[PDB]
């Protein structure tokens, strides 16, 4: 049931090699994986009990080589990769028992070129002393601005520990400039706290932006900074 | 095949409703998913007949009539998300997907508050953002017109300790608050801090 798949989003150029991982929980022999588009139209790729194929989407159509050995993840892999093929790549799987379990999926985006991927620059924004006076609350807003693709994952951080009470993040990046199909994502994210809380400057707050940029093996020939998948953060000590 | 209804969905905090599948083909089980935002299918149910509960979700299948039903009651934001059916045929481990029913839930705000506050910078005191907050789910937040400006849509948080919920969206630029968000209908009562 507790289905393990890796990474968890995949920026590749056109032409590039595009390898994802499924492991699935031990006492599970069957794996499937499925392709969700945007449209949230799925469509089976492959089935495999033990090593063996079981069923298969029309060979014609067939865009991947896919295996599963024994003790070894289920990998599922694009050779020539193309603009068609993103997508969310899903693998689930069962033990008789007919029941499927996801896996988290991976987000595959296929671009011309690696050549306008940007990490993301991160900045928090302290709360307004009117809100705190007039509400007795204390909002603060992380901003994560020039990222592409949109691959991030944004989270908070309170004295160290995670935190999902009193967040709200953007479902939707925007794009800074809409007229680019090729433009840069900004988001946003609200954590509330109680004045009180915000006012103790033994507080620590840190906004987290983890990107999915390229690998070691992406060839990086430009001048500036390679893109690389990392963390972004920012942060704020509580404030009398 | 499968054909899944509604298509998308707006439900009060509180209330209730119930999603449906029709089999346009015999199938000899179905599962319901909720598809969160960060793309996990969760897993609620499996069924090959009758009937079984899950907390305040229900769901029926019944193959001969050819059709699986997920009730949802009092309705809570965790509930948001994309619901999914998925069946196995009759005569093909595959699973067939309906079209999916995209789950709103509408907060019900207790005691709405609008306002615009100005935020500073950690870093930088010059950079700021301005943060339109505490009005009641009748509100709708517009994009911006002008390309300089980046304004988000509403974002409901829940402050679960305090039970307290908000709503709010954010605008930023390289301007004022008090006409960040003009192109929006916002209350009469708008509080705008005189800074």
């Known amino acids: 049931s507790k289905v393990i798949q890796t990474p968890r989003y995949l920026v590749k150029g056109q032409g590039q090699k595009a390898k994802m991982r499924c492991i699935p929980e031990k006492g599970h022999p069957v794996v499937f994986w499925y392709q969700q588009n945007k449209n949230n139209e799925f469509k089976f790729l492959i089935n495999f009990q033990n090593q063996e194929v079981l069923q298969q989407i029309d060979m014609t159509e067939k865009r991947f080589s896919a295996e599963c050995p024994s003790n070894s993840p289920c990998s599922l892999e694009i050779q020539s990769s193309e603009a068609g093929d993103s997508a969310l790549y899903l693998c689930?799987?069962?033990?008789?028992?007919?029941?499927?379990?996801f896996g988290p999926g991976t987000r595959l985006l296929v671009l011309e070129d690696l050549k306008n991927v940007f990490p993301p620059e991160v900045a928090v924004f302290e709360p307004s002393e009117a809100e705190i006076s007039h509400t007795q609350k204390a909002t603060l807003v992380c901003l994560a601005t020039g990222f592409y693709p949109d691959h991030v994952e944004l989270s908070w951080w309170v004295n160290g520990k995670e935190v999902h009470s009193g967040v709200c993040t953007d479902p939707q990046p925007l794009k800074e400039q809409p007229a680019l199909n090729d433009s840069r994502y900004a988001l946003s994210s609200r954590l509330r706290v109680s004045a009180t809380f915000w006012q103790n400057p033994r507080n620590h707050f840190r906004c987290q932006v983890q990107f999915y940029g390229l690998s070691e093996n992406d060839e990086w020939t430009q001048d500036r900074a390679k893109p690389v998948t990392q963390i972004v953060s920012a942060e704020a000590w509580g404030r009398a | 095949q499968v054909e899944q209804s509604p298509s998308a969905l707006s439900l009060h905090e509180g209330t209730g409703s119930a999603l449906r599948c029709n089999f346009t083909?015999?199938?000899?089980?179905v599962q319901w998913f909720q598809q969160n935002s960060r793309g996990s299918l969760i897993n609620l149910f499996y069924?090959?007949?009758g009937t079984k509960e899950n907390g305040r979700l229900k769901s029926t299948f019944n193959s001969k009539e050819s059709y699986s039903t997920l009730h949802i009651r009092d309705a809570q934001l965790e509930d948001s998300g994309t619901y999914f059916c998925?069946?196995?045929?009759?005569?093909?481990?595959?699973?067939?997907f309906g079209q999916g029913t995209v789950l709103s839930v509408i907060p019900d705000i207790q005691n709405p508050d609008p306002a615009v506050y100005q935020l500073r910078d950690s870093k930088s005191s010059d950079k700021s953002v301005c943060l339109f907050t505490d009005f009641d789910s009748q509100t709708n937040v517009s994009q911006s017109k002008d390309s300089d400006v980046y304004i988000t849509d509403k974002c409901v948080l829940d402050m679960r300790s305090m039970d307290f919920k908000s709503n709010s969206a954010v605008a930023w630029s390289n301007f004022a608050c008090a006409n960040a968000f003009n192109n929006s209908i916002i209350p009469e009562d708008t509080f705008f801090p005189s800074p």
């Open positions: 069924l090959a007949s």
């Open positions: 083909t015999t199938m000899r089980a």
């Open positions: 998925a069946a196995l045929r009759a005569t093909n481990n595959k699973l067939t």
């Open positions: 689930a799987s069962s033990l008789s028992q007919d029941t499927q379990y």
